[PDB]
Structure formats: C-alpha cells, structure tokens
A paper describes a structure:
The structure of the monomodular Pseudomonas aeruginosa bacteriophage JG004 lysin Pae87 is presented and investigated in relation to repurposing its function as an antimicrobial agent. The structure of Pae87 shows that it is a one-domain protein with the typical α/β lysozyme fold.
When Pae87 was crystallized together with the hydrolyzed peptido­glycan sacculi, we expected to see a fragment of it bound to the catalytic cleft. Surprisingly, the peptidoglycan fragment (comprised of linked NAG, MurNAc, l-alanine and d-glut­amic acid units) was bound to α-helices 4, 5 and 7 on the opposite side to the putative catalytic pocket, in the same place in which a polyethylene glycol fragment was modelled in the apo Pae87 structure. Tyr128 probably establishes a CH–π interaction with the l-Ala methyl group. The most important binding residues would be Arg93, Gln121, Asn125 and Tyr128, because they each make more than one bond to the ligand. In the crystal packing, the peptidoglycan fragment contacts a neighbouring protein molecule; this may be the reason why the ligand-bound form crystallized in different conditions and in a different crystal form that diffracted X-rays to higher resolution. Regarding the catalytic activity of Pae87, the disaccharide found in the soluble product bound to the crystallized protein (NAG-MurNAc rather than MurNAc-NAG) already indicates lysozyme activity, as described in the literature for this family. A peptidoglycan fragment was bound to this region of the β-lobe in the Pae87–peptido­glycan crystal structure. From these results, the existence of a cell-wall-binding site within the catalytic domain can be proposed. In the absence of a CWBD, this region may be used as a binding site by Pae87 and the other related lysins that contain it, perhaps performing a function in the endogenous lytic activity.
Author numbering: 0 to 186
The structure:
C-alpha cells in the first residue's frame, strides 16, 4: 500500500504552515507507524461505547447490548479482528459502526467526519482506504479544525500540544518530552 513519502510530509507541513520536522515529530510520537494491516485494510480500533452512544442517539432509546455495542468501554480483540468487530457493528447500523472506529495512522474517530469536512461518513472511510498520505491529510484537517492545537504546534509548545491532543494525562506517557526529542532528531 502507498506509505508516507517525503512529499506527503512536505505537503502536510505546507498545509499546516509548520516545518517538516514538526510533522515528522508528531507522526513519530502520535501515529501507529503504519496506517494499514497486512490484509491491506486500514488499521482500526472499534470503540463499543461510542457504538452504544451513537446508536442510542439515532434510535432515541438504548440499542441491544453485545460485545460491539456496550456502554462499558473495552473488549478489544486487536489487529485484523477489529475489522470483524466493525463488521458485526455494521450489521446493527453501518453509519454508527463506521463512526465508532478510530482509523488510520493517527487513530481518528470516524464521528469526526463532518467536522473534518468530508461529504459523508463513507467519504471519510474511503480517505482511510486511499493511502497513508490521505490518512495524514485526515490528521491535517483535525489540526486545522482545532486552532488552539494548531497554534501550539506552530509555536513548538509541545506541552500545550500534548495536553490538548493527548489530554490531561499526557504526562503519564511523557508525550511532551517525546515530541521535543523527536523534533530535535528531525531538525
């Protein structure tokens, strides 16, 4: 499958108005490294508590509870088996299921499709299948629609970036220091 090129990094850097070293640093620290499984489908993690929340909102009442639709988070099988979980959830409701997986290099939740400017959940999904460059573009859009994160990236304020991107427990995995060290390694 089409993996990340120097041009993918340069295009992303240009679109975000940051240096290439910043994009490589955030990719090294925040990505899954590869955006695709051996089978050629995008890497996903299926989030059954998002499936429960989104299908509840759609139906106006609680859906059936099972291993892929449950207010209790977890129950991961990992790797290719997450596609089997997605398939079971699609057979409950396709749009809720696709929105309840995290996709590609940066593990972006499908429920962000509309905010990210995709025409539909399906267009978001097609962008995950297209290439690693397309998945990096999903990440670019995510930064653009989050100006405070965008500004932290531009200013190389790794702690502010990690607090907003990784959340309040970012320091548990030292995300700020990993970003700073990665940046120095590429600069």
């Amino acid at each position: 499958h089409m993996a990340l090129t120097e041009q993918d990094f340069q295009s992303a850097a240009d679109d975000l108005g940051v240096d290439v070293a910043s994009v490589k640093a955030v990719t090294k620290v925040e990505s899954r490294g590869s955006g695709f499984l051996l089978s050629g489908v995008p890497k996903i993690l299926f989030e059954r508590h998002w499936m429960f929340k989104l299908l509840k909102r759609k139906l106006g009442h609680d859906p059936e509870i099972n291993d892929v639709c449950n207010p209790k988070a977890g129950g991961y099988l990992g790797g290719q088996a997450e596609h089997e979980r997605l398939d079971k959830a699609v057979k409950m409701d396709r749009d809720c299921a696709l929105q309840s997986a995290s996709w590609g290099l940066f593990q972006i939740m499908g429920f962000h499709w509309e905010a990210l400017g995709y025409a539909s959940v399906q267009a978001f999904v097609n962008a995950q299948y297209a290439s690693e460059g397309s998945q990096l573009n999903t990440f670019v859009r995510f930064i653009k629609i989050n100006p405070a994160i965008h500004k932290a990236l531009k200013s190389k304020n790794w702690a502010e970036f990690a607090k907003r991107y990784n959340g309040p427990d970012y320091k548990k995995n030292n995300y700020d220091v990993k970003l700073a060290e990665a940046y120095q390694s590429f600069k």
